[PDB]
Design a protein around this ligand. Structure first.
Ligand SMILES: CC(=O)N[C@@H]1[C@@H](O[C@@H]2O[C@H](CO)[C@H](O)[C@H](O[C@]3(C(=O)O)C[C@H](O)[C@@H](NC(C)=O)[C@H]([C@H](O)[C@H](O)CO)O3)[C@H]2O)[C@H](O)[C@@H](CO)O[C@H]1O
Ligand SMILES: CC(=O)N[C@@H]1[C@@H](O[C@@H]2O[C@H](CO)[C@H](O)[C@H](O[C@]3(C(=O)O)C[C@H](O)[C@@H](NC(C)=O)[C@H]([C@H](O)[C@H](O)CO)O3)[C@H]2O)[C@H](O)[C@@H](CO)O[C@H]1O
Ligand SMILES: CC(=O)N[C@@H]1[C@@H](O[C@@H]2O[C@H](CO)[C@H](O)[C@H](O[C@]3(C(=O)O)C[C@H](O)[C@@H](NC(C)=O)[C@H]([C@H](O)[C@H](O)CO)O3)[C@H]2O)[C@H](O)[C@@H](CO)O[C@H]1O
Ligand SMILES: *[C@@H]1O[C@H](CO)[C@@H](O)[C@H](O[C@@H]2O[C@H](CO)[C@@H](O)[C@H](O)[C@H]2NC(C)=O)[C@H]1NC(C)=O
Ligand SMILES: *[C@@H]1O[C@H](CO)[C@@H](O)[C@H](O[C@@H]2O[C@H](CO)[C@@H](O)[C@H](O)[C@H]2NC(C)=O)[C@H]1NC(C)=O
Ligand SMILES: *[C@@H]1O[C@H](CO)[C@@H](O)[C@H](O[C@@H]2O[C@H](CO)[C@@H](O)[C@H](O)[C@H]2NC(C)=O)[C@H]1NC(C)=O
Ligand SMILES: *[C@H]1O[C@H](CO)[C@@H](O[C@@H]2O[C@H](CO)[C@@H](O)[C@H](O)[C@H]2NC(C)=O)[C@H](O)[C@H]1NC(C)=O
Ligand SMILES: *[C@H]1O[C@H](CO)[C@@H](O[C@@H]2O[C@H](CO)[C@@H](O)[C@H](O)[C@H]2NC(C)=O)[C@H](O)[C@H]1NC(C)=O
Ligand SMILES: *[C@H]1O[C@H](CO)[C@@H](O[C@@H]2O[C@H](CO)[C@@H](O)[C@H](O)[C@H]2NC(C)=O)[C@H](O)[C@H]1NC(C)=O
Ligand SMILES: *[C@@H]1O[C@H](CO)[C@@H](O)[C@H](O)[C@H]1NC(C)=O
Ligand SMILES: *[C@@H]1O[C@H](CO)[C@@H](O)[C@H](O)[C@H]1NC(C)=O
Ligand SMILES: *[C@@H]1O[C@H](CO)[C@@H](O)[C@H](O)[C@H]1NC(C)=O
Lengths: 321, 162, 321, 162, 162, 321
């Protein structure tokens, strides 16, 4: 007669690593690393992302005519943007402090667009001839829908003096620009005045832009340039414009109704018609794991990202052969 | 293993003990079979369960990357940002892989310890009333029926009675 | 007869955590986390901090008349500043490279103020009429005490040409500014000359400021603006000014006598009449612990900051019930 | 615990042993009492004292935050700076809490080990001259006075004399 | 040490055992000498070899500093960069020194464990046919020649034969 | 008769540390920290570094006449530069976005220099009188060899209008500058035109530089200043210059033939005539250790840097006394 002490064994092939020994078979283990994803861009807790498709943030905000899809967009969860969107600045140029603006968007979930300076309002100057071949719509020369490219009316460009008061409660994003012509003959041809300026003032802002002339390579069939500037106009504060020419005036400005958690995701993927609690640029994650290894930049209630291919904890004991 | 029992003086585990991690196998006139030790098993289950939750919890607070963009003449701060975000990911990857490695080794040793302690508990009861075979088994000098077996599993095996 | 082996037990209720078991009572333990602080701003090893109170660094350095308390301040250990100090730039404007300057102060423990361009010295121009309602003192219109707002004398503003040589051994902090008026009529009213400039030169510096005109919201009852610039004038080097108008000239400049360990602490607290070896924005720390959890930004010989609520080491053994 | 002694085969500690962590309790005609084992106790005190100083020292070099300010159009580098300083604080917090967790477990096991080793040292001396009760106690076959007890505590207990 | 053998119940090591880490010394009519235990020694060599490679490998991915320069009015981002690169070096220095400290302690305990387990393996074979001296040595009751010694080292020591 | 179990001991004095015990002698150990270096700057896998010696990157690229050694340099592995190189900008001034350029060099292993605007080409203007005492060669007044300091020819400075097309496949580094004179009399003396400008255009670039006049301390015997600008001209793209004066025109521009792993090492050491797989500013490393403690900034296949003085692993067991 005998009694023995012993331990469990089973048909398990689960292996775990230790400091002294790799590939130790154990009776029980717990994988803690999510390795899979659905490969799609999805809504985040119901809330659809803003998928800019081929448009860039600049093309969207300034209102590139190829970006009509994104005129008055609803609340978003996150924004998606391609690495090299084709519909950026149709008319060649620069967007001043563009990254600092993009950073502001990472904290914004919704814009409401409103008109601050009506197009009809320009009685002294011409407002419906500010178009280009570089920036076409339905086969015709068009322009950034949110700003007005003003030019001389009957061979005269009188000094502009316009103000907008931010009466509404919400911070306002105001966008304007300046045109840089190719030569002195172009300057007079569009604006008459040879030496022009654009002065912009607010509580904080003290700007005075002047056109820089230079001969430049054609980009989208145009050698001229546009340089777009922006500000955030606080509540109950006014912005004051004044200019002799080269002024790309605001028509519409975006109102900041909702601020929250958001991000600008870089991804070539399109919408997937799904929902998720956790989204990455490569796809969405649905798991209760404490870790994943899909992509570092995520949004939502996510596991922690690590660079590992494998993380498995021993729960059971060394399994017998 | 550190404590010598699992894959040591006890060559291998038991496919036939399904209801626990550690336990007893008996052999007498009336028959044979496995009986899990509930107390030591449940104690081991709590230890490991807490370990896992402790690991998951410690790693709860950990670096999260945020998207930041930079223009063509901000290459230094772009690179700074790149090396910063990567630096943390490498630190946290290391932290995770090592913690797993270290605690895996401890978890296997923990099981070994539980088996050894259970073995020693029985050894201290039988004392001279059984022959210690050297393989996990104790061969009795007196005949030992199912009550006698059960009393060893109880902790109520009387030396004076035998 | 018997002999037993056993271990210590006591009436201890001290608990410590382990990986496998939380709240394990032990006979002995060692807390290593300081959780308390006196809640006060104190001197650091005898040396009192500079508590700016309602003044900002700008208001202090430029010499806002509300900041007379901080005219010629003694050596400090650290500086304290409120989150939103009311006495900043009394006359609305900007302080150029302000943060980069603040960074320099984190390495400075003492300024000695000295006059480089006497107020009386301005014979060609008027120096005692450079005041404003935005920047009042004892109910009357005053101005930044360390700079002189020069204006035309008898309807003329001749070109200024002034130099200062840094003869003294210590690096010198020189402060000056430029005035931006509201319109062309204000420009002539104060300075006569319509197009003005301010050129500043040193070994390194090559500046040429020009006034930017724009119509701006009133801030502290004024629509004009001031833009303040600065430099560090090395030993044995000269700074050269030249201007047609809008020039806010230096009178006093700060001498950098002592450089050392310091910091600009953000705190709403006031002076506490205490002494300490280790100071935080929330209060001071007096302990021999290796860690604390009060606040990350500290100064002096301090424990290390962690985010923990509890760090207790087992020294003893599992205590019996 | 890993080594089976503390809260294992030795059910509980002794309120009555005040002058040490580990030791002996005796019972004979002449009386009873506790005697701490000085050597094993002091050895344990050194181990733990060094542990604590080693922990304190390793954490001596650790990230210190510095105040940095940024204007309204430096939001990216402000955020970079924020995430950088937080990242280190989270890494060092983790390092501190884990080190404590891991070494606490080791410290309790260390004490268990010291008790087990002390138990085994006595076991190897008494051998067959005493009955191993299974609870930390050895019951003598010969009568054992205070010199006889002291000789066990000495390490000078002669098997041949008894 | 945790397992009590090395510098515990076995006072010291053997200069005369050159061909292994753990082993046997015998004394009988025919002579005396050392014999390394090949199995337990090689097992220990593998464990430590893997440990070292595991340590080296885990530290393979680690922060590398990159040179970045900044002008006289970029002092904040220069300092940010300085504190960032130092922060990682301090984190990785800590990681390296601690890992060494912790695994060194484990490596010494590991050796202790191997000796204890080897001791216990022999103890379980000899059982009552030898007197357990309490110092690592077993004194035989029967006379034990070189075959008899070899059979203990084999694992083939028959209790029934003696 | 007896058989004993025991363990190895030897004559080893190697010590290792543990948490509970410092200086534990062991039978075997493994040092994993490289502490030594040869103290020399060496070639990296055969490929010699570019050792600028007393020249700076600026002095090299602009072509300071003291930096003739570094005219047409071969492919390098890494670059070495002193902390304070004496042969920087001989003619006092500034190098615009200099650090951003230095950063580009960290990714470049070879330049091929080529002429884009020949010196002879300047028929309308004088090109061989653009020299200074601050920037001497063989005892005579010379200048930056890669740019041409143009001045008036026979009391006239007609508007310059030059273009270069990047026909070659490789990105091109173009360098130019602007001269800032001391006064109005110097402006006319060199360029005749009182108000000048330099406009530079590419696909992306839209620049318009204007000379800033100010009276400045002499630096290297000169109070005037030069301000050097640069761009990367993409393939098949043209750069367009136009100027009334003060123009420091390109002659030679560097072609970017090879991009790879490189770095700008700061070190006072000179060439050592050695080879290595791993180089640091203090010397080179030859070891199979996983760690070293020489210097953080390294290049090549190196061990990892730590701040430790000692890292030794126990392999063996506690050695007996
Ligand atoms: C009118 C015409 O057909 N001209 C032919 C020349 O082409 C024109 O060249 C000019 C300048 O050299 C512009 O690029 C013209 O393009 C536009 C554009 O952007 O599409 C035409 C727009 O109507 C005009 N819009 C406004 C509001 O002014 C716009 C702007 O002037 C410029 O962009 C400002 O910089 O320019 C282009 O059509 C052609 O070069 C020539 C043969 O060489 O033959 C001309 O008949
Ligand atoms: C003189 C007077 O009482 N004018 C009344 C107008 O008020 C004046 O409006 C002007 C410009 O519109 C200024 O703001 C005046 O304020 C001061 C100031 O800062 O206090 C007055 C100072 O003396 C003057 N100082 C100097 C050195 O010039 C200062 C500067 O000019 C400006 O700040 C430069 O930008 O301005 C203010 O008193 C009032 O607007 C009008 C009714 O609308 O009635 C006038 O009688
Ligand atoms: C011609 C001469 O000998 N003049 C004596 C004065 O010295 C001259 O002072 C001027 C301006 O005050 C310049 O610095 C002169 O230096 C040069 C230089 O850099 O070496 C001379 C160069 O030939 C000239 N080159 C060009 C292309 O113009 C250069 C430039 O003009 C300036 O650098 C542009 O800023 O200047 C220097 O020789 C002397 O000051 C005076 C006594 O005070 O006596 C004069 O005879
Ligand atoms: C428009 O913005 C101006 C500042 O440029 C702001 O002051 C106006 O608000 C009113 O200004 C009055 C003084 O001019 C003031 O008496 C009044 O309290 C204030 N109204 C409010 C609601 O704050 C703005 N115009 C408005 C609100 O019609
Ligand atoms: C004032 O600053 C000038 C530079 O703008 C500096 O050179 C002066 O110092 C003196 O300059 C002399 C040349 O002009 C030189 O011969 C003399 O050695 C030098 N003196 C010293 C002490 O360095 C400064 N003026 C002084 C010191 O009176
Ligand atoms: C010079 O650079 C111009 C842009 O400024 C570039 O377009 C030239 O290349 C050619 O341009 C032609 C149009 O003007 C085009 O028809 C042709 O395909 C293109 N050639 C190539 C090889 O791309 C450049 N000049 C050249 C290459 O001689
Ligand atoms: C454990 O088992 C033993 C033996 O099976 C139990 O002792 C028996 O208990 C039954 C039921 O109460 C009695 O009728 C018998 O007389 C006992 N037999 C013997 C041989 O002791 C014992 O009660 C159990 N103890 C536990 C579970 O603590
Ligand atoms: C430890 O204790 C034993 C017993 O108490 C000591 O042996 C006695 O020593 C005394 C004093 O020297 C002698 O007079 C007695 O004859 C001894 N009695 C017995 C029973 O041995 C012993 O010397 C001590 N050894 C130590 C502390 O190492
Ligand atoms: C280990 O050693 C024992 C004793 O030396 C071996 O037993 C002997 O084996 C030899 C050679 O085969 C025989 O001729 C003897 O008759 C045996 N003698 C005794 C006393 O048993 C045994 O075979 C070995 N076993 C191993 C290595 O597993
Ligand atoms: C462990 O197993 C993996 C996959 O099964 C294999 O690729 C690897 O080489 C093994 N590693 C070791 C150290 O045996
Ligand atoms: C441990 O004790 C604390 C405070 O005494 C209590 O709040 C906590 O819930 C306990 N945790 C566990 C895991 O028992
Ligand atoms: C260990 O040894 C070193 C050098 O041999 C010595 O300087 C140091 O003080 C020792 N440390 C301890 C804790 O004994």
């Amino acid at each position: 007669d005998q009694i023995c002490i012993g331990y469990h064994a089973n048909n398990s092939t689960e292996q775990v690593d230790t400091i002294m020994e790799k590939n130790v078979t154990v009776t029980h283990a717990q994988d803690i690393l999510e390795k899979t994803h659905n490969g799609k861009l999805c809504d985040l807790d119901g809330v659809k992302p803003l998928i800019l498709r081929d448009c860039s943030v600049a093309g969207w905000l300034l209102g590139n005519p190829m970006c009509d899809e994104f005129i008055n967009v609803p609340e978003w969860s996150y924004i998606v943007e391609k690495a090299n969107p084709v519909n950026d600045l149709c008319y060649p140029g620069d967007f001043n402090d563009y990254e600092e603006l993009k950073h502001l968007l990472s904290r914004i979930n919704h814009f409401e667009k409103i008109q601050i300076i009506p197009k009809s309002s320009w009685s002294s100057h011409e407002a419906s001839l500010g178009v280009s071949s570089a920036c076409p719509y339905q086969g015709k020369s068009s322009f950034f829908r949110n700003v007005v490219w003003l030019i001389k009316k009957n061979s005269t460009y009188p000094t502009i003096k316009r103000s907008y008061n931010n009466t509404n409660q919400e911070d306002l994003l105001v966008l304007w620009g300046i045109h840089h012509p190719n030569d002195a003959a172009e300057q007079t041809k569009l604006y008459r005045n040879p030496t022009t300026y654009i002065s912009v003032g607010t509580s904080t802002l003290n700007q005075r832009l002047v056109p820089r002339i230079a001969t430049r390579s054609k980009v989208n069939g145009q050698s001229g340039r546009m340089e777009f500037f922006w500000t955030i106009l606080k509540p109950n504060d006014a912005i004051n414009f004044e200019s002799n020419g080269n002024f790309i005036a605001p028509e519409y400005a975006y109102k900041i109704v909702k601020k929250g958690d958001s991000t600008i995701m870089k991804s070539e993927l399109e919408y997937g018609n799904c929902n998720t609690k956790c989204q990455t640029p490569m796809g969405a994650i649905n798991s209760s794991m404490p870790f994943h290894n899909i992509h570092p930049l995520t949004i939502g209630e996510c596991p922690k990202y690590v660079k590992s291919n494998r993380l498995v904890l021993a729960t059971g004991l060394r399994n017998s052969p | 293993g550190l404590f010598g029992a699992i894959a040591g003086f006890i060559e291998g585990g038991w496919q036939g003990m399904v209801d626990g991690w550690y336990g007893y196998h008996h052999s007498n006139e009336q028959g044979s079979g496995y009986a899990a030790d509930k107390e030591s098993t449940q104690k081991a289950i709590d230890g490991v369960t807490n370990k896992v939750n402790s690991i998951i919890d410690k790693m709860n607070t950990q670096f999260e990357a945020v998207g930041r963009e930079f223009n063509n003449l901000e290459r230094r701060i772009e690179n700074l940002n790149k090396k910063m975000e990567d630096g943390f990911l490498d630190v946290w990857t290391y932290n995770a892989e090592l913690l797993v490695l270290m605690e895996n080794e401890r978890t296997l040793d923990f099981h070994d310890s539980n088996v050894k302690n259970l073995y020693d508990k029985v050894r201290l009861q039988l004392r001279d009333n059984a022959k210690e075979l050297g393989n996990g088994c104790f061969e009795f000098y007196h005949k030992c029926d199912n009550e006698c077996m059960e009393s060893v599993r109880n902790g109520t095996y009387d030396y004076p009675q035998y």
